[PDB]
Coordinates of C-alpha atoms and ligand atoms in Angstrom, one line a residue:
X13 CA 49.0 -45.2 77.6
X14 CA 46.7 -44.2 80.5
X15 CA 47.1 -46.4 83.6
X16 CA 43.3 -46.5 83.8
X17 CA 43.2 -48.3 80.4
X18 CA 41.8 -51.8 80.7
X19 CA 44.1 -54.8 80.5
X20 CA 42.6 -58.1 79.2
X21 CA 43.5 -60.7 81.8
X22 CA 42.4 -64.0 80.1
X23 CA 45.9 -64.7 78.9
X24 CA 47.2 -64.6 82.5
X25 CA 44.6 -66.8 84.2
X26 CA 46.5 -70.1 83.8
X27 CA 49.6 -68.9 85.7
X28 CA 47.4 -66.6 87.9
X29 CA 44.1 -68.5 88.5
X30 CA 41.3 -66.3 89.7
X31 CA 42.7 -63.1 88.2
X32 CA 39.9 -60.5 88.0
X33 CA 38.5 -60.0 84.5
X34 CA 38.2 -56.2 85.3
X35 CA 41.8 -54.9 85.5
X36 CA 43.5 -51.6 84.7
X37 CA 47.2 -51.1 84.1
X38 CA 47.3 -49.2 87.4
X39 CA 46.1 -52.4 89.2
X40 CA 48.4 -54.7 87.2
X41 CA 51.4 -52.7 88.1
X42 CA 50.5 -52.8 91.7
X43 CA 50.1 -56.6 91.5
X44 CA 53.5 -56.7 89.8
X45 CA 54.8 -55.3 93.1
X46 CA 55.6 -51.8 91.9
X47 CA 57.5 -42.4 83.6
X48 CA 53.7 -42.4 83.7
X49 CA 53.2 -46.1 82.8
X50 CA 55.4 -49.2 82.5
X51 CA 53.4 -50.3 79.5
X52 CA 53.2 -48.3 76.2
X53 CA 50.9 -48.0 73.2
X54 CA 51.6 -49.7 69.9
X55 CA 52.4 -46.2 68.5
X56 CA 55.0 -45.6 71.1
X57 CA 56.3 -49.1 70.6
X58 CA 56.7 -48.6 66.9
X59 CA 58.7 -45.4 67.4
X60 CA 61.0 -47.4 69.6
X61 CA 61.3 -50.6 67.6
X62 CA 65.1 -50.5 68.0
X63 CA 64.5 -51.1 71.7
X64 CA 62.4 -54.2 71.3
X65 CA 63.5 -57.3 73.3
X66 CA 61.2 -60.3 73.2
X67 CA 60.9 -61.7 76.7
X68 CA 59.3 -65.0 78.0
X69 CA 59.4 -66.8 81.3
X70 CA 58.4 -70.4 81.6
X71 CA 57.8 -72.3 84.9
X72 CA 62.8 -72.6 89.1
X73 CA 62.0 -70.3 86.1
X74 CA 63.5 -70.2 82.6
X75 CA 63.8 -66.6 81.3
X76 CA 64.1 -66.3 77.5
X77 CA 65.1 -63.2 75.5
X78 CA 64.9 -62.6 71.8
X79 CA 68.7 -62.4 71.9
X80 CA 68.6 -66.2 72.2
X81 CA 69.7 -66.2 75.8
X82 CA 68.0 -68.5 78.3
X83 CA 68.7 -68.0 82.0
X84 CA 67.4 -70.2 84.8
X85 CA 66.6 -68.4 88.1
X86 CA 66.2 -70.5 91.3
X87 CA 70.0 -72.3 87.8
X88 CA 71.2 -69.4 89.8
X89 CA 69.6 -67.0 92.4
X90 CA 68.0 -63.8 91.3
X91 CA 70.8 -61.6 92.7
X92 CA 73.2 -62.9 90.0
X93 CA 70.6 -63.4 87.3
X94 CA 69.8 -59.7 87.4
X95 CA 73.4 -58.8 86.9
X96 CA 73.5 -60.9 83.7
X97 CA 70.3 -59.3 82.5
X98 CA 71.8 -55.8 82.8
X99 CA 74.9 -56.8 81.0
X100 CA 73.1 -58.6 78.2
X101 CA 70.6 -55.7 77.6
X102 CA 73.4 -53.1 77.8
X103 CA 75.5 -54.9 75.2
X104 CA 72.6 -55.5 72.9
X105 CA 71.0 -52.0 73.1
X106 CA 73.8 -49.5 73.7
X107 CA 74.3 -48.7 70.0
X108 CA 70.6 -49.0 69.2
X109 CA 68.3 -47.2 71.6
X110 CA 68.0 -45.1 74.8
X111 CA 65.6 -47.6 76.4
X112 CA 64.3 -51.2 76.4
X113 CA 60.8 -52.3 75.4
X114 CA 60.0 -55.8 76.6
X115 CA 57.7 -57.4 74.0
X116 CA 55.5 -59.9 75.7
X117 CA 52.9 -62.6 75.0
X118 CA 52.0 -62.4 78.6
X119 CA 50.7 -65.5 80.5
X120 CA 51.8 -64.4 83.9
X121 CA 55.3 -65.5 85.1
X122 CA 57.1 -62.8 83.0
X123 CA 55.1 -60.0 84.7
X124 CA 55.6 -61.4 88.2
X125 CA 59.3 -61.9 87.6
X126 CA 60.0 -58.2 86.9
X127 CA 60.1 -57.2 90.5
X128 CA 63.3 -59.4 90.8
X129 CA 65.4 -57.4 88.3
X130 CA 63.5 -54.1 87.6
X131 CA 63.4 -50.9 89.6
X132 CA 61.3 -47.8 88.7
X133 CA 61.0 -44.2 89.6
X134 CA 61.4 -40.7 88.1
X135 CA 63.2 -40.4 84.8
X136 CA 66.8 -39.9 85.5
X137 CA 70.1 -39.2 83.7
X138 CA 73.3 -41.3 83.7
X139 CA 75.9 -40.6 86.3
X140 CA 78.7 -40.3 83.7
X141 CA 76.9 -38.8 80.7
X142 CA 73.7 -37.0 79.7
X143 CA 71.9 -40.0 78.3
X144 CA 68.7 -41.1 80.1
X145 CA 69.3 -43.8 82.8
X146 CA 68.4 -47.4 81.9
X147 CA 70.1 -49.2 84.9
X148 CA 70.5 -48.8 88.6
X149 CA 73.2 -50.1 91.0
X150 CA 72.3 -51.0 94.6
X151 CA 76.0 -51.0 95.4
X152 CA 76.7 -47.3 94.7
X153 CA 73.1 -46.0 94.5
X154 CA 73.8 -44.6 91.1
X155 CA 72.2 -44.6 87.7
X156 CA 73.6 -45.3 84.2
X157 CA 72.8 -45.5 80.6
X158 CA 73.4 -48.6 78.5
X159 CA 77.0 -47.4 77.8
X160 CA 78.1 -47.0 81.5
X161 CA 76.2 -49.8 83.3
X162 CA 79.2 -52.1 83.8
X163 CA 78.6 -53.8 87.2
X164 CA 75.1 -52.5 87.6
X165 CA 72.5 -55.0 88.9
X166 CA 69.0 -53.6 88.1
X167 CA 67.1 -52.5 84.9
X168 CA 65.6 -49.1 85.5
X169 CA 62.4 -47.7 84.1
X170 CA 62.0 -50.4 81.4
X171 CA 59.0 -50.2 79.1
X172 CA 56.9 -53.1 77.9
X173 CA 53.9 -54.1 75.7
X174 CA 51.7 -57.2 75.8
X175 CA 51.0 -58.4 72.2
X176 CA 48.1 -60.4 73.5
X177 CA 46.2 -57.1 74.1
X178 CA 46.1 -56.5 70.3
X179 CA 43.3 -58.9 69.6
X180 CA 44.5 -62.4 68.7
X181 CA 42.7 -65.8 68.6
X182 CA 44.8 -68.8 69.4
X183 CA 48.2 -69.2 71.0
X184 CA 51.5 -67.6 70.2
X185 CA 52.8 -70.3 67.9
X186 CA 49.6 -70.6 65.8
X187 CA 49.6 -66.8 65.1
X188 CA 53.4 -66.6 64.5
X189 CA 53.5 -69.6 62.2
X190 CA 50.9 -68.1 59.9
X191 CA 53.5 -65.6 58.7
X192 CA 56.9 -67.1 59.4
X193 CA 58.6 -70.4 58.9
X194 CA 62.1 -69.5 60.1
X195 CA 61.6 -69.5 63.9
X196 CA 60.9 -73.0 65.3
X197 CA 59.4 -73.9 68.6
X198 CA 62.0 -75.9 70.5
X199 CA 60.2 -75.4 73.9
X200 CA 62.7 -73.1 75.3
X201 CA 61.7 -69.7 76.6
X202 CA 64.0 -67.8 74.1
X203 CA 62.1 -69.5 71.3
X204 CA 58.8 -67.9 72.5
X205 CA 60.6 -64.6 73.1
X206 CA 61.8 -64.7 69.5
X207 CA 58.4 -65.6 68.1
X208 CA 56.8 -62.9 70.1
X209 CA 59.0 -60.1 68.7
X210 CA 58.7 -61.6 65.2
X211 CA 54.9 -61.5 65.4
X212 CA 55.0 -57.9 66.7
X213 CA 57.3 -56.8 63.9
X214 CA 55.0 -58.5 61.3
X215 CA 51.9 -56.7 62.7
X216 CA 53.6 -53.3 62.8
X217 CA 55.9 -53.3 59.8
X218 CA 54.7 -56.0 57.3
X219 CA 50.9 -56.0 57.7
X220 CA 51.0 -52.3 58.4
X221 CA 53.5 -49.8 57.1
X222 CA 53.9 -46.2 58.3
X223 CA 56.6 -44.3 56.4
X224 CA 55.8 -41.0 58.2
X225 CA 57.6 -42.2 61.3
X226 CA 61.2 -41.0 61.5
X227 CA 64.0 -42.6 63.6
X228 CA 67.0 -40.9 65.1
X229 CA 70.5 -41.1 63.6
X230 CA 72.5 -43.8 65.4
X231 CA 75.3 -44.6 62.9
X232 CA 76.5 -43.9 59.4
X233 CA 73.0 -43.3 58.0
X234 CA 73.9 -40.1 56.2
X235 CA 77.2 -41.4 54.7
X236 CA 75.4 -44.6 53.6
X237 CA 72.6 -42.7 51.8
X238 CA 75.0 -40.3 50.1
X239 CA 77.2 -43.3 48.9
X240 CA 74.1 -45.0 47.6
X241 CA 73.2 -41.9 45.5
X242 CA 76.8 -41.6 44.3
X243 CA 77.0 -45.2 43.3
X244 CA 73.6 -45.2 41.6
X245 CA 74.6 -42.3 39.4
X246 CA 78.0 -43.8 38.6
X247 CA 76.7 -47.3 37.6
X248 CA 73.7 -46.1 35.6
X249 CA 75.8 -43.4 33.8
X250 CA 78.4 -46.0 32.9
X251 CA 75.9 -48.6 31.7
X252 CA 74.2 -46.1 29.4
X253 CA 77.6 -44.9 28.1
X254 CA 78.8 -48.5 27.5
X255 CA 75.8 -50.1 25.9
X256 CA 73.9 -47.1 24.6
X257 CA 70.5 -48.4 25.5
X258 CA 67.7 -46.3 23.8
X259 CA 65.3 -46.6 26.8
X260 CA 65.6 -47.1 30.5
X261 CA 62.8 -48.6 32.6
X262 CA 63.0 -47.2 36.1
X263 CA 61.0 -49.5 38.4
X264 CA 60.5 -48.6 42.0
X265 CA 59.8 -45.5 44.2
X266 CA 56.8 -43.5 42.8
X267 CA 58.8 -40.4 43.7
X268 CA 62.0 -41.4 42.0
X269 CA 64.1 -38.8 40.1
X270 CA 66.3 -39.4 37.1
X271 CA 69.7 -40.4 38.6
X272 CA 71.6 -39.5 35.4
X273 CA 69.8 -36.2 34.3
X274 CA 72.1 -35.5 31.4
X275 CA 71.7 -38.9 29.7
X276 CA 70.2 -39.2 26.2
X277 CA 68.1 -42.2 27.0
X278 CA 64.3 -42.3 27.0
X279 CA 63.6 -42.5 30.7
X280 CA 60.3 -44.2 31.7
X281 CA 59.1 -44.5 35.3
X282 CA 57.0 -47.3 36.8
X283 CA 55.6 -47.0 40.4
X284 CA 56.2 -49.6 43.0
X285 CA 56.4 -49.0 46.7
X286 CA 58.8 -51.1 48.8
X287 CA 57.4 -54.6 49.1
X288 CA 57.3 -55.3 52.9
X289 CA 56.2 -58.9 52.9
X290 CA 57.1 -61.0 49.8
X291 CA 59.3 -60.0 46.9
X292 CA 57.3 -58.7 43.9
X293 CA 56.5 -61.3 41.2
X294 CA 58.1 -60.0 38.0
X295 CA 55.2 -61.5 36.1
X296 CA 52.8 -59.1 37.8
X297 CA 55.0 -56.0 37.7
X298 CA 55.7 -56.3 34.0
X299 CA 60.4 -54.1 29.1
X300 CA 62.6 -56.2 26.9
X301 CA 63.8 -53.1 25.1
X302 CA 66.7 -51.2 26.6
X303 CA 67.6 -51.7 30.3
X304 CA 65.6 -52.0 33.5
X305 CA 66.7 -50.3 36.7
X306 CA 65.6 -52.0 40.0
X307 CA 67.1 -49.7 42.7
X308 CA 65.8 -51.4 45.9
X309 CA 62.8 -52.8 44.0
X310 CA 62.8 -56.4 45.3
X311 CA 61.5 -58.9 42.7
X312 CA 61.6 -62.7 42.7
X313 CA 63.6 -62.9 39.5
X314 CA 65.2 -60.0 37.7
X315 CA 65.1 -59.8 33.9
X316 CA 68.4 -60.3 32.0
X317 CA 68.5 -56.7 30.9
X318 CA 68.7 -55.2 34.4
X319 CA 70.8 -53.0 36.7
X320 CA 70.0 -54.0 40.4
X321 CA 70.6 -52.8 43.9
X322 CA 69.3 -55.3 46.4
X323 CA 69.7 -55.1 50.2
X324 CA 71.1 -58.3 51.8
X325 CA 69.0 -58.9 54.8
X326 CA 71.6 -61.1 56.4
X327 CA 74.0 -58.2 57.0
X328 CA 74.9 -57.5 60.7
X329 CA 74.7 -53.8 61.6
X330 CA 73.1 -51.5 64.1
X331 CA 70.7 -50.3 61.3
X332 CA 69.5 -53.8 60.4
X333 CA 67.2 -55.5 62.9
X334 CA 66.0 -59.2 62.7
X335 CA 62.7 -59.4 60.9
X336 CA 59.9 -61.8 59.9
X337 CA 60.3 -65.0 57.9
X338 CA 63.9 -64.4 57.0
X339 CA 63.4 -60.7 56.3
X340 CA 65.0 -57.9 58.1
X341 CA 63.8 -54.5 59.4
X342 CA 66.2 -51.9 58.0
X343 CA 65.9 -48.7 60.0
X344 CA 67.6 -45.7 58.2
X345 CA 65.6 -42.6 58.8
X346 CA 62.5 -44.7 58.1
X347 CA 61.7 -48.4 58.9
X348 CA 61.7 -50.7 55.9
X349 CA 60.9 -54.3 56.4
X350 CA 62.7 -56.2 53.6
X351 CA 62.0 -59.7 52.3
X352 CA 64.7 -62.3 52.8
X353 CA 67.8 -62.1 50.5
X354 CA 67.5 -64.8 47.8
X355 CA 70.4 -65.4 45.5
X356 CA 68.3 -67.2 42.9
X357 CA 66.7 -63.8 42.1
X358 CA 69.9 -62.8 40.3
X359 CA 70.3 -66.0 38.1
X360 CA 70.0 -63.9 34.9
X361 CA 72.7 -61.4 36.1
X362 CA 76.2 -61.2 37.4
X363 CA 77.8 -59.3 40.3
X364 CA 78.7 -55.7 39.3
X365 CA 82.5 -55.2 39.4
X366 CA 83.9 -52.2 41.1
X367 CA 85.0 -49.4 38.9
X368 CA 85.4 -45.7 38.9
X369 CA 84.4 -43.7 35.8
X370 CA 84.8 -40.0 35.1
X371 CA 84.8 -37.7 32.0
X372 CA 85.3 -34.6 34.1
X373 CA 88.4 -32.4 33.2
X374 CA 91.7 -33.3 34.7
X375 CA 100.8 -41.2 46.9
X376 CA 100.3 -41.4 43.1
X377 CA 97.3 -43.6 42.2
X378 CA 97.9 -46.7 40.1
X379 CA 94.7 -48.7 39.4
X380 CA 93.2 -50.7 36.5
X381 CA 89.7 -49.6 37.7
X382 CA 90.2 -45.8 37.5
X383 CA 88.5 -45.3 34.1
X384 CA 89.6 -41.8 33.2
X385 CA 91.3 -40.0 30.3
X386 CA 94.5 -39.5 32.4
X387 CA 94.7 -43.2 33.2
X388 CA 94.2 -44.1 29.5
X389 CA 97.2 -41.8 28.9
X390 CA 99.4 -43.5 31.5
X391 CA 99.2 -41.4 34.7
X392 CA 96.2 -40.6 36.9
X393 CA 96.0 -37.0 37.7
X394 CA 95.6 -35.7 41.3
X395 CA 91.9 -34.7 40.9
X396 CA 90.8 -38.1 39.6
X397 CA 93.1 -39.8 42.2
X398 CA 91.3 -37.9 44.9
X399 CA 87.8 -38.6 43.5
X400 CA 88.7 -42.3 42.9
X401 CA 89.6 -42.8 46.6
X402 CA 86.5 -40.9 47.7
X403 CA 84.3 -43.0 45.4
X404 CA 86.0 -46.2 46.6
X405 CA 85.3 -45.2 50.2
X406 CA 81.6 -44.6 49.4
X407 CA 81.4 -47.9 47.4
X408 CA 82.9 -49.9 50.4
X409 CA 80.6 -48.1 52.8
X410 CA 77.5 -49.1 50.8
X411 CA 78.6 -52.7 50.5
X412 CA 79.4 -53.0 54.2
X413 CA 75.9 -51.6 55.0
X414 CA 74.5 -54.6 53.2
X415 CA 73.6 -53.5 49.7
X416 CA 74.6 -55.7 46.7
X417 CA 74.9 -54.7 43.1
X418 CA 74.0 -56.8 40.0
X419 CA 74.1 -56.1 36.3
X420 CA 73.4 -57.6 32.9
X421 CA 76.0 -60.2 31.9
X422 CA 77.2 -58.2 28.9
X423 CA 78.4 -55.3 31.0
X424 CA 82.1 -54.7 30.3
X425 CA 84.0 -51.7 31.6
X426 CA 86.4 -52.1 28.7
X427 CA 83.7 -50.4 26.6
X428 CA 84.1 -47.2 28.6
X429 CA 87.6 -46.4 27.5
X430 CA 86.5 -45.3 24.0
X431 CA 84.2 -42.6 25.5
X432 CA 87.5 -40.8 25.9
Ligands
LIG506 O1 59.5 -75.9 78.4 C1 60.0 -74.8 78.2 N1 61.2 -74.4 78.8 C2 61.9 -75.3 79.7 C3 61.8 -74.9 81.2 N2 62.8 -75.1 82.1 C4 62.4 -74.6 83.4 C5 63.3 -74.6 84.6 C6 64.9 -74.8 84.8 C7 63.9 -75.9 85.3 C8 61.1 -74.1 83.4 S1 60.5 -74.2 81.9 C9 59.2 -73.8 77.3 C10 57.9 -73.9 76.9 C11 57.7 -72.8 76.0 N3 58.8 -72.2 75.9 N4 59.8 -72.7 76.7
LIG507 ZN1 76.1 -42.8 80.3
LIG508 ZN1 59.2 -65.6 63.0
LIG509 ZN1 92.4 -37.0 35.3

């Protein structure tokens, strides 16, 4: 974002009466009392969604953050408030991003408060590792990343974006409430901060959707994705073996592949991209023959003859970010906004029980859920013991990452034993 780009100042003129209508970012930064630009484009913001922290200041000043924290600066003086800000941001962001992006609905006080807890300069590295520096300490004159900032007092080279520059009519609440009923306005700064981030997420990940953007690996992305593939193949293979459906309706990703390539079923594909806003209405999408597979195809009510994987947006993890209207922004390689988990969608189904099935050739493993020829015969062999434990690990990884599994009520693993 060029510092010579124009900044629309109308939103700031109640806190800053007389502000010039003609204003560049260069001038704004100077007026703020201060790494080419502190402010960033929407495109840069979207790439760094994991770093978004909503931030509002209301006038003694109340500072609100999308973390829910409200701090009062006078109430405590800025030299202690800034220490809290560093700690809060470090703990929130250390496992998410290499920076912070303050998401604003700027009316003035937030921008003029930055001088009191922000320092800027050349891009730097941490004193104790190779990560970029996000904090500065006036005590030791050293720099740190989010992981090594304990006892640091200033945020260093933060980034920020004013949502009000995107072309809105009306105030924050009126624009936020058009899309979301989950964040109230309790007239605390943190409430505005949360609404501001929520509006931003909606505009960039619900209204618009860019699946070309890739996001760095920050956790168990790869293990989770491999487990999801392993579980999908297991559950679908077993379902076809147990109930011998003549046809399978695979509803979802237009680029989906047969997950059980050696199955005898008639495999029919139906295209549906991830629904970012509201769950798909089954009436519109639609199938009573055979079985329907909804692998991360979120519908309002699944048919009774279904196999389902549905992401639970309430799960707490470094991959799952708070979203809009109860939804969550799941960032795993790509960013997927996901409508809120709704248990009523599974009323026609039941939870899929854990099991391990294998027809491959054959501490000792004892388990009622190791469905193998050797267990049928009384003693699980080493190979299938090894594979059972690896599958169980993958199964638990995918559950812990927030995915939930559902199946037609007639599904019975007892029917798999006679495949041997
Ligand atoms: O009234 C809001 N916050 C309450 C406030 N307390 C202070 C100071 C400690 C005395 C300033 S403002 C509000 C309005 C919109 N969002 N929050
Ligand atoms: Zn470090
Ligand atoms: Zn909201
Ligand atoms: Zn075996």
